[PDB]
């Protein structure tokens, strides 16, 4: 007797999204998941699945579903896929080479851009190594690019690791904001708590 409709509304229709560097994960459990409200929509321009068919999900049960949400610019949406490189894949959000799930993205220019520019969405520009799959780094220490310690002062080879996107309405589509939801489907030797409406 799994409990209530899965809160995909809270994820997809959140008034603000997370910065990609501090990407949000909602663990979805103990609920009936209506996936048809997603794949029957014309509002999602990217809905790329790997190993999972959306159509079968309404008749399938999982131990857990994971919804990762964040904002990136249009040109970077191709980096949210297995075996990709770039600032986002390397330093912000990394899918594993063997990622099984769906990447959902839509243009959010109407929500996340403002006249004068919205700069509240950040990404990590600098890191000493690439993220492991599904790793999250929200550290805000000065990036020491050289051999000399920074001692809390920015300067030569001493840079802040985070940078604003400049989301303005008049941006080219590549530089417009895109909201992203990565659905991971978990199946363990445990009771299934996330089932489609057809059980």
């Amino acid at each position, epitope marked *: 007797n799994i409990t209530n409709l899965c809160p995909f509304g809270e994820v997809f229709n959140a008034t603000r999204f997370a910065s990609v560097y501090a990407w949000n994960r909602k663990r979805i459990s103990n609920c009936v998941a209506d996936y048809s409200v997603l794949y029957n929509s*014309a509002s999602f*321009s990217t809905f790329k699945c790997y190993g999972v068919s959306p159509t079968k999900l309404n008749d399938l049960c999982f131990t857990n579903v994971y919804a990762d949400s964040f904002v990136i610019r249009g040109d970077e949406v191709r980096q949210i896929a297995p075996g990709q490189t770039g600032k986002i894949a390397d330093y912000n959000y990394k899918l594993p080479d063997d990622f099984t799930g*769906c990447v959902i993205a839509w243009n959010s220019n109407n929500l996340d851009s403002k006249v004068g520019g919205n700069y509240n969405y950040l990404y990590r520009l600098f890191r000493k190594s690439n993220l492991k799959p599904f790793e999250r780094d929200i550290s805000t220490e000065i990036y020491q690019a050289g051999s000399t310690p920074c001692n809390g002062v920015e300067g030569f080879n001493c840079y802040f690791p985070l940078q604003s996107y400049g989301f303005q309405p008049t941006n080219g589509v590549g530089y417009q904001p895109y909201r992203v939801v990565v659905l991971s489907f978990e199946l363990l030797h445990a009771p299934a708590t996330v089932c489609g409406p057809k059980k």
Partner: nanobody, 123 residues
Framework: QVQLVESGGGLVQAGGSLRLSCAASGGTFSTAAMGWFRQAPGEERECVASIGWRGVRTWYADSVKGRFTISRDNPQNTVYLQMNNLKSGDTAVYYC??????????????????WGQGIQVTV
């Protein structure tokens, strides 16, 4: 490799009907969103129409809406662009594009994975 073969282009005059077709090999056509892009010789690539894997959902650019119809024949791995009421400003190289394993309705160039060589339509 993924091969997108476009035909049905060439010369027409204003008010004339031209039917572009794009035959796909190896993009798992059935689970691919398909798109038609055009590029005028002094402009940049714009998406003019796109269609979902089932052929239920369609998107059209404002400049061609009501005049162009996109459709698909999944058993034949072919997407069509019926272009009616052509005006002189439709003249461009038309590219068919595949967004593979995409269950959405893409319209941005970066959301597509494979491109045809493109066919000249001069009105």
């Amino acid at each position: 490799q993924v091969q997108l073969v476009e035909s049905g282009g060439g010369l027409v005059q204003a008010g004339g009907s031209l039917r572009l077709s794009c035959a796909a090999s190896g993009g798992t056509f059935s689970t691919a969103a398909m798109g038609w892009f055009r590029q005028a010789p002094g402009e940049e690539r714009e998406c003019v129409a796109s269609i979902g894997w089932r052929g239920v959902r369609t998107w059209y650019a404002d400049s061609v809406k009501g005049r162009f119809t996109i459709s698909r024949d999944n058993p034949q791995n072919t997407v069509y662009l019926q272009m009616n009421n052509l005006k002189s400003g439709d003249t461009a190289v038309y590219y068919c594009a595949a967004s593979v394993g995409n269950y959405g309705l893409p319209w941005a160039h970066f959301e597509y994975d494979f491109w045809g060589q493109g066919i000249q339509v001069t009105v």
